[PDB]
């Protein structure tokens, strides 16, 4: 079931042209014949202890890939359970912690195809005395304190269906432009036009209105599903709905526009 992104009242004028801007560059479909089928996660530390005070990437996991350590030392020190890729527990383990190792950690997720990314922030500290070695939660971040050289764990788990493995067949991202007939309540529209990720478009109703219902030929690619209705008629009067669903990314959204034909004034 989709979720109403927004509801807008459209004062469409008879004879003139009206535009429904339903679109999202996030919904953009990959143009190359090889649509991205991989996702990446990584860990990066920003330790101000370094005079360079830059952010350095400890390691990164690639979907269906092989674990690869950026440097020559984090191997053994950094443990990223391979099976956890299915579990989603993208946690990090340090064997020994030095005074130069404490700082700011960040676990980041990136996905090119879905164009969805996330970041979570954590703090690590090291002390010579275990008396002050105690974790605490700051709401916006977590602070870890542990003895020098002691094994420590940093949790990064999202528990999301998209980020866990699901080799589902890539259902075409359905897009539906459906207009409620005149004097009809919402959710009772008949599909004016249907758009598939493959680029095929299914037209409904008269062909002349579809031609005047200008839609960019690259809408399935660019995602510009905005509906441009020209030579407005009383028949076109009624609410419009722009539904989008992406099974692979799992997105489901709908935009409702109260399109009423108004005579020129």
């Amino acid at each position: 079931n989709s979720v109403v992104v927004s509801v807008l009242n459209i004062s469409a004028t008879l004879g003139s042209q009206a535009v429904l801007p339903c679109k999202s560059y996030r919904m953009v479909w990959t143009q190359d014949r090889l649509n991205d089928r991989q996702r990446v996660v990584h860990w990066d530390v920003y330790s101000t202890y370094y005079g360079d005070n830059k952010m350095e990437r400890l390691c990164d996991m690639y979907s269906a890939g092989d674990q690869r350590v950026y440097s020559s030392y984090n191997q053994g020190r950094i443990f990223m359970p391979q099976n956890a890729f299915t579990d989603g527990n993208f946690s990090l383990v340090i064997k020994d912690v030095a005074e130069s190792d404490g700082g700011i950690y960040s676990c980041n997720l990136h996905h090119h195809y879905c164009h969805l990314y996330e970041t979570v922030k954590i703090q690590l500290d090291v002390t010579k005395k275990a008396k002050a070695a105690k974790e605490y939660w700051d709401g916006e971040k977590a602070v870890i304190v542990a003895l020098e050289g002691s094994t420590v764990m940093l949790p990064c788990v999202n528990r999301n269906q998209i980020w866990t493995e699901r080799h589902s067949e890539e259902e075409q991202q359905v897009v539906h432009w459906d207009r409620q007939p005149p004097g009809v309540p919402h959710d009772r529209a008949d599909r004016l036009i249907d758009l598939y990720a493959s680029g095929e478009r299914r037209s409904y109703g008269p062909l002349f209105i579809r031609q005047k219902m200008n839609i960019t030929d690259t809408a399935f690619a660019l995602g510009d599903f905005s509906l441009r209705i020209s030579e407005l008629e009383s028949a076109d009067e009624g609410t419009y709905s722009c539904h989008l669903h992406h099974h692979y990314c799992g997105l489901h959204e709908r935009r409702i526009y109260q399109v009423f034909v108004t005579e020129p004034v």
């Binding site: 190359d32 014949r33 090889l34 649509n35 067949e169 890539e170 493959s198």
Partner: protein, 52 residues
């Protein structure tokens, strides 16, 4: 998934084709009866490479 990003296969127009039903030879003299509503070519070599 139908979408594919590997391989490359050629594609070209076809060559000629042959049939007997176009030609009937019940009598001594030749007879050609091409299917109705279809352009057809024919060739014979006696004397010269004559086509019609």
């Amino acid at each position: 998934l139908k979408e594919t990003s590997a391989g490359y296969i050629t594609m070209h127009r076809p060559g000629p084709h042959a049939y007997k039903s176009y030609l009937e030879e019940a009598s001594g003299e030749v007879y050609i009866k091409p299917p109705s509503g279809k352009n057809v070519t024919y060739e014979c070599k006696c004397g010269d490479y004559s086509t019609g």
